[PDB]
Amino acid sequence: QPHIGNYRLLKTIGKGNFAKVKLARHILTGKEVAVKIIDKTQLNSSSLQKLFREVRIMKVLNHPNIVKLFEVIETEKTLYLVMEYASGGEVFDYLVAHGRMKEKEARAKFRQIVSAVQYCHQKFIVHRDLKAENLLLDADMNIKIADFGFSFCGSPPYAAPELFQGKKYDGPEVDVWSLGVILYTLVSGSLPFDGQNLKELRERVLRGKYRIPFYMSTDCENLLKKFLILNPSKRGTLEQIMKDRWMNVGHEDDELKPYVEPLPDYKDPRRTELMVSMGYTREEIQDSLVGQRYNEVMATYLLLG
Ligand SMILES: Cn1cc(-c2cnc3c(-c4csc(C(=O)N[C@H]5CCCC[C@H]5N)c4)cnn3c2)cn1
Numbered sequence: 001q002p003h004i005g006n007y008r009l010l011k012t013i014g015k016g017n018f019a020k021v022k023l024a025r026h027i028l029t030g031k032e033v034a035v036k037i038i039d040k041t042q043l044n045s046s047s048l049q050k051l052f053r054e055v056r057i058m059k060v061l062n063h064p065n066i067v068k069l070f071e072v073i074e075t076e077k078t079l080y081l082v083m084e085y086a087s088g089g090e091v092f093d094y095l096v097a098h099g100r101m102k103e104k105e106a107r108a109k110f111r112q113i114v115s116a117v118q119y120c121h122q123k124f125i126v127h128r129d130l131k132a133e134n135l136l137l138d139a140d141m142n143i144k145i146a147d148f149g150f151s152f153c154g155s156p157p158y159a160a161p162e163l164f165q166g167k168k169y170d171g172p173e174v175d176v177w178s179l180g181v182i183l184y185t186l187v188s189g190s191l192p193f194d195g196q197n198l199k200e201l202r203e204r205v206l207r208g209k210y211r212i213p214f215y216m217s218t219d220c221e222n223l224l225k226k227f228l229i230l231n232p233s234k235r236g237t238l239e240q241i242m243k244d245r246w247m248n249v250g251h252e253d254d255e256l257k258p259y260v261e262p263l264p265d266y267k268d269p270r271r272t273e274l275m276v277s278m279g280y281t282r283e284e285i286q287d288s289l290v291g292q293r294y295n296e297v298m299a300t301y302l303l304l305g
Contacts, residue, residue: 002027004080005073005296007035016151018042023085028278029303033070036081036149051079054149057125058083059294062261065116066145067136071299082299086144088137091186100189103217104250110183111247111256112143117179118238119259121172128170130178131158132185156201157181157191161230164202173232176241180227187220188213192228206230219246266290271304 192210266289
């Protein structure tokens with residue numbers, strides 16, 4: 001029945017140059033899941049570093065709006081990251097279909113995005129490469145941030161000004177800039193900076209002047225100004241941005257705060273027993289959850305949600 005572990009591969013839903021993503025079915029539960037398959041035999045050093053960083057990141061993130069990791073399968077030649085499947089697909093697709101989002105809907109999505117990126121930042125993680133393909137949707141139209149493994153058509157229009165001026169290109173401030181671009185695209189359905197070429201693009205970014213769409217609220221535009229600051233050391237933190245008026249319109253008793261991760265349940269008597277009857281030991285279930293092993297036992301545990 002299965003192609004790898006407990007998974008019947010179904011359909012390629014994404015191709016990168018060094019990685020394929022497949023839609024697949026867990027067999028014991030029959031849930032749909034995303035499998036990232038990386039051929040390590042093709043990868044050079046920087047690629048390999050990038051990959052092991054990805055695995056590190058994925059094992060740690062536990063957010064409603066970032067794709068969740070279920071299992072890692074390692075062989076010498078090939079690595080598999082089994083993660084959550086977002087059936088809504090790319091937010092890019094959605095924009096092309098229905099045009100720009102009304103500020104109400106953009107806000108709902110953007111509160112999610114900001115929550116997720118600031119969560120990462122809390123854990124001293126910066127994505128450094130937020131572009132359109134990183135924003136996916138679940139079936140209820142929730143945001144799902146995807147891919148921390150960098151896998152040049154998408155990149156440039158989301159690049160912070162530092163890139164083009166030789167300055168260091170690390171730090172949460174990079175992501176803050178990208179969030180501005182993303183915001184602009186949600187409400188306008190287009191990019192703040194584009195060019196017919198790389199120099200055009202670079203001049204427009206270094207200038208940092210986007211053009212204001214006539215239909216756009218002044219509240220939105222004050223939000224934009226908080227993200228798209230040229231000087232990296234003068235850009236706000238997402239924690240500060242969270243307090244923003246536009247961020248909170250319609251949540252007047254529900255301001256946006258940093259995500260508080262809920263305490264772990266590695267001892268669900270319900271699921272545990274169902275796995276003892278399914279052929280696992282209790283010491284092995286607990287040891288896998290607490291050792292946070294992301295093994296076959298852990299995958300089954302989480303997938304019974
Ligand atoms: C209807 N519909 C649903 C989907 C769709 C596409 N991709 C995904 C993923 C995903 C997890 S890691 C990853 C990735 O790293 N991709 C990389 C490899 C593939 C190329 C892009 C890269 N960012 C993608 C999860 N759910 N999901 C759903 C698409 N259409």
